[PDB]
Amino acid sequence: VREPATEAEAALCAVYAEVLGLDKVGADADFFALGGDSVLTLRLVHRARSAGWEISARHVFRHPVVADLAAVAQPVT
């Protein structure tokens, strides 16, 4: 399983695992391949912000892989 290589990747890995109910998730994990849907996307957006990273639901649907999602995130102001 692929370790995160940036702070944003590491935060999103942890949030993916928490939202999807998994123990740990790799930096190459696909949110919808792992069981994501509209409800869980909503939760991912909220919990990512709590972890310091601003994303949208549209970001998740367009970039469901952790590493790709981390690249469009913005740090919370």
Residue numbers in the entry: 3521 to 3597
The authors write:
Given that the PCP2 and PCP3 domains of the fuscachelin NRPS are highly similar (65% sequence identity), and that PCP domains can act as both aminoacyl donors and acceptors for C domains, we rationalized that the arrangement observed in our structure is a valid model of an acceptor-PCP-bound C domain. Importantly, the residues at the interface with the C domain are conserved or highly similar. Furthermore, computational docking of the PCP3 domain onto the acceptor-PCP binding site of the C3 domain showed that it binds in an almost identical orientation to the PCP2 domain in the structure of the PCP2-C3 didomain.
Non-ribosomal peptide synthetases are important enzymes for the assembly of complex peptide natural products. Within these multi-modular assembly lines, condensation domains perform the central function of chain assembly, typically by forming a peptide bond between two peptidyl carrier protein (PCP)-bound substrates. To address this, we report the structure and biochemical characterization of complexes of a PCP domain bearing a stable analog of the acyl acceptor complexed to the acceptor site of a C domain from the NRPS that biosynthesizes fuscachelin in the thermophile Thermobifida fusca. The C3 domain of the didomain resembles other members of its class, comprising a pseudo-dimer of CAT domains with bridge (R2923 to T2944) and floor loop (A2843 to L2858) regions.
